[PDB]
């Protein structure tokens, strides 16, 4: 992605304060609560009966760490996201059958989570930088769909 040097540093700097496992569990849980149709891939996870059950489900939390760890590693390759996520893109299309709109939803939920976590430090320009990144990752993941 085209991020100015400033934007890159803003992204990197906040990210350094993130507990990946924690934010991961939170973001994935919030996706499943706010946009319930996304639960369609997770029937094997058990109880998703209430917000409390979703947020507390160890499977959701585990999948969240997995998803955000991948995201996190991608942050190191801002310049080659399509490349970095090519295999995952194919996997998501061919085996998992995940509509890429889900990637966009998660990106918006992730920004809300950072906002909630960081408060005032998540300024309008830091948000803007993260918006470009989450759109970039969603695009990179949807790239190999056919």
């Amino acid at each position: 992605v085209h991020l100015t040097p400033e934007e890159k540093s803003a992204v990197t700097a906040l990210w350094g304060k993130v507990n990946v496992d924690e934010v991961g569990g939170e973001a994935l849980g919030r996706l499943l609560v706010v946009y319930p149709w996304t639960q369609r891939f997770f029937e094997s996870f058990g109880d998703l009966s209430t917000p409390d059950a979703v947020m507390g489900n160890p499977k959701v939390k585990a999948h969240g760490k997995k998803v955000l760890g991948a995201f996190s590693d991608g942050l190191a390759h801002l310049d080659n996201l399509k490349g970095t996520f090519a295999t995952l893109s194919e996997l998501h299309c061919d085996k998992l059958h995940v509509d890429p709109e889900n990637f966009r939803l998660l990106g918006n939920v992730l920004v809300c989570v950072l906002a909630h976590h960081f408060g005032k430090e998540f300024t309008p320009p830091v948000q803007a930088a993260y918006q470009k990144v989450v759109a970039g990752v969603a695009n990179a993941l949807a790239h190999k769909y056919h």
Partner: protein, 142 residues
């Protein structure tokens, strides 16, 4: 999204002409959709999506019939499509974005088959009508 008396008139007239071919046009719309917007294929991993597939034709007929029922109950759509709203919301769980893509493909299909009837006014009415159907279908998502 309100359907005026002229919109209702337009829709019943155009759908009227579809008549017998509704199922064939439903299948064609799906085909158009899978070719133009490949992400929509993610919801039918269990189908043979090849041209002429009977599964697509079968599904096309079910969609077209639901549309026919919607036209017939254009004043009472929510109740007429109740079971379909439940189904999509709670089992299929198709992302709402997809409804716009099928609606567009149905419009393209109608255009290609009803030259005379597909006037700018009818086109507008049909677009509103498909948006209303989509709204109903996703009304119980959350």
């Amino acid at each position: 999204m309100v359907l005026s008396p002229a919109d209702k008139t337009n829709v019943k007239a155009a759908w009227g002409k579809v008549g017998a071919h509704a199922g064939e046009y439903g299948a064609e719309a799906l085909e158009r959709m899978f070719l133009s917007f490949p992400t929509t294929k993610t919801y039918f991993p269990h189908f043979d999506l090849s041209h002429g597939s009977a599964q697509v034709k079968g599904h096309g007929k079910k969609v077209a019939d639901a549309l026919t029922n919607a036209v017939a109950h254009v004043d009472d759509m929510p109740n007429a499509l109740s079971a379909l709203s439940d189904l999509h919301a709670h089992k299929l769980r198709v992302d709402p974005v997809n409804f716009k893509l099928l609606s567009h493909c149905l419009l393209v299909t109608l255009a290609a088959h009803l030259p005379a009837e597909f006037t700018p006014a009818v086109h507008a009415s049909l677009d509103k009508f498909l948006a209303s159907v989509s709204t109903v279908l996703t009304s119980k998502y959350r």
